[PDB]
Amino acid sequence: MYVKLISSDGHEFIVKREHALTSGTIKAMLSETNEVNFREIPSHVLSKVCMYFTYKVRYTNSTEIPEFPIAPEIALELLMAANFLDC
């Protein structure tokens, strides 16, 4: 039902398992236990990743889809997180 994703600075993000599976990496890691550590992703990035999971699930097979806001100054970190997570 829920999984816990732990950022490099120790914040714990508790997310619906179905939403976390947006990440190919999380899916493979969970294939059982429900906790995953991301020792190279800080909480200001992982929090945004979790918002993406929610948004991705809510708007799949959508009508016009609202913008996912990404400030330029975190775009590169977000990209590297999304590379690692495969989402």
Binding site: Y52, K56, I65, A71, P72, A75, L78, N83, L85, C87
Partner: peptide
């Protein structure tokens, strides 16, 4: 229609 993956969205945030 589904949202683009986050890899592509993060790229567009700097490319466009």
């Amino acid at each position: 229609f589904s949202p683009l993956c986050l890899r592509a969205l993060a790229f567009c945030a700097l490319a466009k």
